[PDB]
Amino acid sequence: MKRMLAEFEKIQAILMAFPHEFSDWAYCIKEARESFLNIIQTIAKHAKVLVCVHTNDTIGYEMLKNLPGVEIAKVDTNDTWARDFGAISIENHGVLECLDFGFNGWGLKYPSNLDNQVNFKLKSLGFLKHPLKTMPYVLEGGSIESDGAGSILTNTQCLLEKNRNPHLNQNGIETMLKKELGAKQVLWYSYGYLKGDDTDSHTDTLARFLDKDTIVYSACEDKNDEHYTALKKMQEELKTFKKLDKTPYKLIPLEIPKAIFDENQQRLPATYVNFLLCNDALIVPTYNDPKDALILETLKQHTPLEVIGVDCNTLIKQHGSLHCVTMQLY
User: Is the Hydrolase keyword given for this protein (predicted)?
Assistant: First the structure.
């Protein structure tokens, strides 16, 4: 009887990885350092932070060694996205267990030789306190969602991509979800995307459990916006989903902000769905958008937790957001 713990359960720590100059954060390292420090301190008020700091990142070591509720792990990374390389936690017949899935640079698009080895190092360095299982499947933690009660929400955009687990069919992928993570049902959808995203539409940017009865998703009202069709096709798939007691989900649409562009006019994938559920607090990305406050008030209605915005305009320059930079640990 195994089950993937939900993000809304009691979290012991949040695993992260500090930006350093041995990566694309190099071309704006000072801003990157700032936001992560601001994010880190926001989160440490609600859960202990365990942060990977590249073995050669002296500056970041300093910036972080005297921060209350922060523990540092000297572990090298390609990048900051601990959500997708971080261990996936299951409770297996009572016992906490960490699953080390293969991380492969989002279907081999980016270098991930260091990211993939992160869990291994943390465990060998004694930072991870539970058994660590090496998994023979490629799986990112941002690609799947658990309600902790046997339902896994995920999509085909990501999971059936040719560079994840090509030797498996959809049936075979669902079967490993059932057998490794303890899913009783797998909720699958097929539409929805964000322009600028390279993860192959990670569910954690599109559609997530807020709680065991509620799915929060990315939305677009602008019929002129390129996303309108695919996001409304996605919404109608969400509407077909039933809980294990056969009752519909409550569904909470969060409208994506106004278009954000890089300096070469390529659109950035901003979304409010890339929140972190963090013990007493729901921490929510904001984008210096007029609709930021509305998002936050909207969510306050559906949770007894404290809603905190945190600015992620720096994070989305590198095509990810708050949730992508975290992994909860139990």
Answer: yes
